[PDB]
A paper describes a structure:
The ORFs of these viruses coding for the major capsid protein VP2 were cloned into the pFastBac1 plasmid to enable the production of the virus-like particles (VLPs), using the Bac-to-Bac expression system in insect Sf9 cells.
Its capsid (VP1) amino acid sequence identity is 37% and 41% for BPV and HBoV1, respectively. Following cryo-EM data collection, three-dimensional-image reconstruction of the capsids, utilizing 50,866 (CnMV), 98,388 (PBoV1), and 9199 (RBoV) individual capsid images, resulted in a resolution of 2.72, 2.31, and 2.52 Å, respectively. In contrast, the CnMV capsid shows very prominent threefold protrusions, while PBoV1 and RBoV follow the previously described characteristics of the genus. Additionally, a different loop confirmation of VR-IX in CnMV, PBoV1, and RBoV compared to HBoV1 and BPV near the twofold axis further causes an increase in the radial capsid surface in this region.
Residue numbers in the entry:
A (entry chain B), B (entry chain A): 44 to 567
C (entry chain I): 259 to 310
D (entry chain I): 517 to 567
E (entry chain J): 208 to 258
F (entry chain I), G (entry chain G): 414 to 464
């Protein structure tokens, strides 16, 4: 009833050979969002020249839970133990419980604000498990459940994309412009069946997860260098004299390999001080039936070549498609393109404060690739491949991740996709755990004039979330001891600890990395 | 439901030959602690020169129940009956019930403060039975449940130790300094599974207890003096004349004994008027890889001898390790080193007001030990042993305890420990009754700015706690009547009684002892 | 393989007073005052040792 | 071991070594141990037990 | 040698040098045979075709 | 250890040899990989704790 | 017992009372035919080893 709890606090991590189970409970707060209504959100009005986008979408009264991050499921201790004791792991399933719900009215009496509970108020809880709504979740959003278990979790508001103002507009006849505008979808969560719960009710959800592995081990040997120098190779290198070729054997310590360095792009980005085109890769969209108005009413394109339309810089900035990290097996951009978790004062350099995946010592990831030719006049020349695509006989490893990395990303729903090897370290999965949407019930109050007037309320409760992790211990024949995740290298010995104000101390002087793939060697 | 009670008031003591059962119920109050957050507590900031410590630790939002004291479980009447009718007793188990919970919001309306109950509010109750959290409980803390059953019990706030500022700091490289700082643990109770309860719920706990006995009997005969004087001993004492030894028999009333006086240290302490080094024994810690900075940034040591580091007085005071009572079988420090339960006005002497265990008449505990030698020139000389350790063939008794003594102490979790014979009278046990932690639920309220803002609430309920005591009655062949615990010797006849203001009258003129081991003789 | 971060003498809660009082010697009499909150006397004696 | 500690703990690791090439072989077949300094791999380095 | 060496602090240089494995075949169980003994081995092979 | 003399002078001295005493608790010192595993207890009538 | 002072002077003193300490092993002294067989252990809460 009203005086019975619908659950209890569940916490702690279980370790075993084949599986690890994490248990977290958070007290959460859900307010009223967006005035209980749906609104269009147009970035052209919200932005300015420093960062401009034509992004259009819908903001909703709903909010959602986000469990996607490792620091959400692992304490620094438990993350250390994962990295030290297991060669790889992946999430098998997620169980979420929402319970001990409280609905309070916010009512002002004089200057005081009084908080009384409405025992008959309800909460809307929607789970979209088949992903029929947009999936607005960017993996690096700051909306994830809090790291410390005693911190309140404010649920983020849900909003999604509709169209690009430059592409979708009223221009031309039988044009991609109108069709993008006509065909723009609208999603309202009240059109799907969902639960409504009062204080005595609770609910639960389970999600099966299929994905690739997070690999904790590193390759000490470049696959090209794994050979025995004591012996000759039968294979001979060409030597060009005049119009003929003379052959000589490769040296014992240089043996040609069948194995090609993995795909990679070393592009840092423009490095500009604005927010216009910050990513290494930007993309522009021009449907072939698109009509350019020659105004600001549409995107702008000049034809550079026959049947080629080059976007203007404003068009590139406007469509705001930013792609990164794209580096894959190239290691030069690692520090610059993977960075996160930094606030910019500009007063003090955050260069060493920022987190990035730069710390991998793996030997399958390349600085530079050189191709070698000889011209007719006898001049050898070598150039480098800065964008190197998928090619037969490539083998490589993912970059390292840390505890502040998001766990998963959603694979786009499309006909075709290539192998899912992420540069940011997420595990792409076709169906991630379904989003749990939460909304306070809309309690209307009578009004003399016609007006939308409701009762100001909010929801508080406890969310318990649990992931079962499939893991594997390592065996090695290595004689020597290996690197492990440890505090010894920290600049600041007092880290992941509390100060006298209650502040949680993380990475104040420098970013202290607790990365995967630090020490465990696998043989080629 | 909300209108049903989850228990009733349980009280009274049951006496029987082999067991005594005490039953207590208290109404308790649990507030919000520490602003619902964890904070670091550093003694260097809180203290001053009169008492300085480098003690560092964490204060928690949680609070706990403390049952450890006899006056908590025994009325003066029931304590009298234990001391008179039983030769020994020990606690077998503890049962605790928490029920009839009430959660009230504290909300200000104008100048008035209104107390309304939140029927959906919850209480967190954590039991750590395997002692995985620090066990911050000093046995003589004033935090125990109240003696009078109608007094409200305010639960104490929980806080624990992390490190010493002098030892654990950022100094040197690969030094014990950084390692102590790096390796400092942090404990958050929200990382363990625990119950959350609303007003209609209740909970219970049982703890099995294994320990040594509290002994109520005294030895009238020194084990060295138990002999029959009517007969000669065959054993002869040496008499040294020049270079030869002549032998003569021991006198009939002096017969040498095999039995050595028990271990003891007679050290009163410095007796200074400050709080710096008040105990008889102080200890200093210097890990061998410790680096002394020659500043106030670390502890300070001068090398007195080769591979010997003597701490400065400030270092001794700073690490604040105080050990007492250490006296064991030595009786001279008994009064001075066992004292407790005194408030210092300095206006009136509390010398006779203070409680201590000074009242034992037992004959196995020694004033002084003399060792006897003879030099080459024929001069006998005798010196005393002020620190006397464990030695073969020792036998002794514990000192007396009173009703204001704590029942148990926790044995440190360590590889090695010697026999558990306490100078303060507690029963050391490997696992004491697990600590019950209690916390009011954190109910957040929305705030416009980002802020941690909660609803001010508190919990009230009833705690019922029960100990089963294993006891043994005494049989004696003594002809004469024996001393018993009785009021006759009291200076103040009106004691453990109430005055017209409701004050509970205890020991105003003088400390009236109701000690164990007063009268019951055991034969050697 | 494990280490104790806490001296067994220092494991106590400073937030609260100890009932136990330290002696102060003036002339032939003893005055008592409570131990400070951060210094609480312990039952536990340092282990055996010889520094030679 | 099981711990409720929040923070990561010290572990036996090469990071503190003065000589990175240790417990390894040289070109003469010599087994390299502690030439510049004694590199300790001790017990009881990091794992806390509560009192 | 160019990558794995003793240079810098908390650098890939030292870590490659520290983390370099060493393999000794006498740390794995294996057969020892005299003149009258023999041994056999079978290996299943999965692969693509030679066309 | 702490005493006070009759004239009111507190004085403190140190215990350089400290034996087994009631209510002691301590840990062993660390070991390393070059430490011997066992030792033989002498064959005798009496022995104290093996630490 | 053997110490060395700061000025470099080694000095040795003797322990005339030596108590129970970890890792001690010893034997009882001999007896003869005129020795008593038993003694009574005092009736007390605590006693050390009976040697």
């Amino acid at each position: 009833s009203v005086g019975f709890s619908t659950g209890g606090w569940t916490a702690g991590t279980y370790f075993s050979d084949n599986k690890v189970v994490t248990n977290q409970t958070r007290q959460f707060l859900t307010p009223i969002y967006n005035g209980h209504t749906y609104k269009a959100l147009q970035a052209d009005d919200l932005t300015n020249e420093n960062d401009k986008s034509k992004w259009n979408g819908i903001t909703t009264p709903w909010g959602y839970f986000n469990f996607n991050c490792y620091a959400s499921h692992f304490s620094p201790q438990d993350w250390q133990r994962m990295c030290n004791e297991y060669k790889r792991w992946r999430p098998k399933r997620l169980r979420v419980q929402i319970y001990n719900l409280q609905l309070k009215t916010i009512q002002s009496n004089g200057a005081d604000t009084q908080y009384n509970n409405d025992l008959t108020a309800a909460v809307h809880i929607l789970v979209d498990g088949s992903h029929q709504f947009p999936w607005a979740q960017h993996p690096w959003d700051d909306t994830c459940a809090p790291e410390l278990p005693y911190v309140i979790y404010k649920t983020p508001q849900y909003a999604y994309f509709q169209n690009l103002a430059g592409l979708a507009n009223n221009v031309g006849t039988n044009s991609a412009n109108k069709f993008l505008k006509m065909n723009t979808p609208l999603y309202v969560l009240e059109t799907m069946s969902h639960e409504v719960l009062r204080t005595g009710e609770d609910t639960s959800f389970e999600f099966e997860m299929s994905s690739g592995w997070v690999d904790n081990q590193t390759n000490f040997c470049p696959p090209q260098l794994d050979f025995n120098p004591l012996h000759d190779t039968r294979r001979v290198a060409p030597r060009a004299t005049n119009n003929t070729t003379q052959y000589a054997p490769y040296p014992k310590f240089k043996k040609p390999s069948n194995w090609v360095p993995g795909p990679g792009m070393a592009y840092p980005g423009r490095g500009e001080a604005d927010g216009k085109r910050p990513a290494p890769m930007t993309v522009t969209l021009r449907p072939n039936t698109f009509i350019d108005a020659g105004n600001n009413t549409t995107d702008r394109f000049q034809q550079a070549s026959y049947q080629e339309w080059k976007p203007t810089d404003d068009t590139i900035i406007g469509q705001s498609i930013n792609v990164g990290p794209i580096n894959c097996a190239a290691t030069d951009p690692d520090a610059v393109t993977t960075a996160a978790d930094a606030e910019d004062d500009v007063a003090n350099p955050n260069t060493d404060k920022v987190s990035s995946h730069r710390y991998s010592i793996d030997m399958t990831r390349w600085n530079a690739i050189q191709i070698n030719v000889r011209r007719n006049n006898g001049t050898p020349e070598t150039t480098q491949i800065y964008r190197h695509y998928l090619y037969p006989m490539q083998a490589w490893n993912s970059n390292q991740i840390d505890r502040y990395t998001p766990i998963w990303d959603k694979v786009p729903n499309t006909e075709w996709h290539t192998m899912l090897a992420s540069s940011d370290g997420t595990l792409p999965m076709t169906h991630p755990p379904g989003t749990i949407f939460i909304k306070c019930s809309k309690i209307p109050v009578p009004s003399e004039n016609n007006a939308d007037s409701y009762l100001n309320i909010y929801c508080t409760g406890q969310v318990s979330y649990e992931i079962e992790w499939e893991c594997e211990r390592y065996n090695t024949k290595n004689w020597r001891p290996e690197l492990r995740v440890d505090p010894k290298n920290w600049t600041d010995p007092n880290n992941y600890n509390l100060n006298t104000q209650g502040g949680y101390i993380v990475n104040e002087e420098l970013y202290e990395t607790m990365p995967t793939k630090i020490g465990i060697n696998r043989v080629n």
